[PDB]
Amino acid sequence: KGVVGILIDQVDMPYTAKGIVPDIILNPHALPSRMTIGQIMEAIGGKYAALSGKPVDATPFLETPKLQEMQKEILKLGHLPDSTEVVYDGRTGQKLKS
């Protein structure tokens, strides 16, 4: 859960080498103490579902496809398997080091 802190225009958002811009930015510090791995898994599964056009089932104990198959298919469709992107700053144009 959270509250909206600021609204940023598309020019000021960080963009990937394809020009894609995030709709929402989440702080990495909210994850490690709450231990919600399902959210990162859902992000990867959603990117796979949008890239491949194939159904994604996340029913507990019976998930199909598995994460490794999802990552291999993400790689074959033109993206990095670990779901990371090369990102530039929209305000200055400089590439982030990570």
Partner: protein
């Protein structure tokens, strides 16, 4: 009279130290600590343009001095940039929070940046983390700065150096 009393006795920066114990109740949080660690680590090298980008969020105007590295390329250091905001007679020796594990050496000769050394307001060793700038940490470097230079200095320091940490996280990129 009410406005004058509120401005003289209740202003925020006059109440940095809590009356429950002799310690600061105002200090760094989550991105501040990791940004300080990433900036103050000894592997961080910066160019003139990156230094100007980092210092543009502060009130700093003046001479940067010479870069720490002159050849083969001119590079600044994160410790060198941090040192611009420490008083020129401040001294501090103490361990860092990251020194819980085997990297602890308990002396100034540490290859892990686990021991903080400040001499004449120059950060020569160690990193900045929860035990140096974190809130509710008594007898920390920030606590000694506030105690020996005034709460106005603490207000100036929190409004200038803590923005640099966020800006450096923005430049470096921090994800999970």
């Amino acid at each position: 009279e009410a406005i004058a009393e509120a401005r003289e006795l209740m202003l925020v920066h006059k109440n940095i130290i809590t009356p429950r114990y002799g310690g600061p109740i105002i200090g760094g949080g989550q991105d501040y600590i990791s940004g300080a660690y990433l900036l103050s680590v000894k592997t961080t090298l910066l160019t003139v343009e990156e230094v100007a980008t980092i210092l543009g969020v502060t009130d700093f105007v003046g001479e940067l001095g010479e870069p720490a590295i002159l050849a083969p390329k001119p590079y600044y250091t994160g410790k060198q940039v941090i040192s611009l905001f420490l008083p020129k007679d401040f001294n501090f020796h103490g361990p860092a929070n990251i020194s819980k594990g085997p990297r602890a050496c308990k002396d100034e000769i540490c290859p892990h940046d686990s021991f903080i050394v400040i001499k004449n307001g120059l950060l020569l060793e160690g990193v900045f983390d929860k035990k140096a700038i974190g809130n509710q940490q008594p007898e920390s470097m920030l606590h000694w700065s506030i105690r020996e230079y005034g709460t106005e200095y603490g207000k100036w320091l929190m409004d200038n150096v803590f923005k640099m940490f966020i800006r450096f996280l923005e430049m470096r990129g921090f994800t999970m």
